[PDB]
């Protein structure tokens, strides 16, 4: 059992903070390795330059091509794969453009049947992908 | 349970509720004292004095008849041993095991019991230091104990 003495507070707190390192959430947010390994560096979004347009295969029970773009972040110069989350927004994407990529939804974890993709594109050429999809505003042609 | 053994024996002496001296006992307080003085000069430990008095002279408790304990009686006269009786016997057992152990090096069991005995020696010695029975610098040396006891 656990100690219950009147002057065992030091043992209780020392044991607590030693055991707090054994759950992933505390280890992740207090070690710093996850922060360094994060391509975004603790940022909600990141701008980048479209390096290529690539297609990713779905998982086993699905069968589709997920239209993603390989992007290099303007800060730290890291190369990541960002999903394009609409039906025909890849055509809205061309080569060498600024794209505001954001996390896909669950904190650096792969989402759905897309393997290894944890980011999605939000804006391209400083105009929203939703606005282009809905026709609210057109490309800066 | 036992300090250095897995054992939970309840074998203990049970003192009577009657603190009064039995009316048949005819030895008075001084008579117990001089019997105690005699047997102590003979070279008997206080525990050995109590058993002989109980088994032969019919005193169930020395403290009940004299009002004072056996070791207190010896120290008051001044013939109590310097080493406490229980501490003396622990060193005696430790020396005997040491003597046996040097003849029989392969007795890993005898070595194990030796550590248990010397652990009890140090724990008892700490208590006696705290009560100031023993000198504050009294150490149990494995080498010099063979002459300290026996």
């Amino acid at each position: 059992g656990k100690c219950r003495g009147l002057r065992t507070a030091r043992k209780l707190r020392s044991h607590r903070r030693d055991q707090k390192w054994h759950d992933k959430q505390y280890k992740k947010a207090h070690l710093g390795t996850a922060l360094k390994a994060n391509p975004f560096g603790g940022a909600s979004h990141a701008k980048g330059i479209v390096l290529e347009k690539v297609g990713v295969e779905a998982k086993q029970p699905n069968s589709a091509i997920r239209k993603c773009v390989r992007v290099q972040l303007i800060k730290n110069g890291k190369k990541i794969t960002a999903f394009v989350p609409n039906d025909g927004c890849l055509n809205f994407i061309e080569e060498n453009d600024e794209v505001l990529v954001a996390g896909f939804g669950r904190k650096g974890h792969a989402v759905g049947d897309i393997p290894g993709v944890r980011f999605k594109v939000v804006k391209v050429a400083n105009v929203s992908l939703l606005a282009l999809y809905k026709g609210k505003k057109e490309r800066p042609r | 349970g036992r300090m250095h053994a897995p054992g939970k024996g309840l074998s203990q002496s049970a003192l009577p509720y009657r603190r009064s001296v039995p009316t048949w006992l005819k030895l008075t307080s001084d008579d117990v004292k001089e019997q105690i003085y005699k047997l102590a000069k003979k070279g008997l430990t206080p525990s050995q004095i109590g058993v002989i008095l109980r088994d032969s002279h019919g005193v169930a408790q020395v403290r009940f008849v004299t009002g004072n304990k056996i070791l207190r009686i010896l120290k008051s006269k001044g013939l109590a041993p310097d080493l406490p009786e229980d501490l003396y016997h622990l060193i005696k057992k430790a020396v005997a095991v040491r003597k046996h152990l040097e003849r029989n090096r392969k007795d890993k069991d005898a070595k194990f019991r030796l550590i248990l005995i010397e652990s009890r020696i140090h724990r008892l010695a700490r208590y006696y230091k705290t009560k100031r029975v023993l000198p504050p610098n009294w150490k149990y040396e494995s080498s010099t104990a063979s002459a300290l006891v026996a």
């Binding site: 219950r4 003495g5 009147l6 | 003192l15 509720y17 603190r19």
Partner: protein
């Protein structure tokens, strides 16, 4: 070894009450035990108890009335002030209507209602309801 004599007496009468025994014998008696048994009697939770006097720590036989539910102990005797007493009340007592928290104060051993009546905190001992 035995370290909390009160904790052992409370557990013994709790187990005996669960089984349904008319009487229970708690082996090591002490002053705190007698006072703790006294407050239970004055609130009617237990019947007569008799302290058997041997020259050692005596024994106690308690007549269980069967109207007890739990008589636990709070082993680390926390210091309870008058401002955190209600936080102990709702944490331990089943309800605000019945149930008693017994704490040792400088005015003696008594329940929380009376301790508050004479405006004094103290050290938590146990509870019963």
């Amino acid at each position: 070894v035995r370290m909390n004599v009160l904790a052992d007496a409370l557990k013994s009468i709790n187990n005996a009450e669960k089984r349904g025994k008319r009487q229970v014998l708690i082996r090591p008696c002490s002053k705190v035990i007698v006072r703790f048994l006294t407050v239970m009697m004055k609130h009617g939770y237990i019947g007569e108890f008799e302290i058997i006097d041997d020259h050692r720590a005596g024994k106690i036989v308690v007549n269980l009335t069967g109207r007890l539910n739990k008589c636990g102990v709070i082993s680390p005797r926390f210091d309870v002030q008058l401002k955190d007493l209600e936080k102990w009340q709702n944490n331990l007592l089943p309800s605000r209507q019945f149930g008693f928290i017994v704490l040792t104060t400088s005015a003696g051993i008594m329940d929380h209602e009376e301790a508050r009546r004479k405006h004094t905190g103290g050290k938590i001992l146990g509870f019963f309801f």
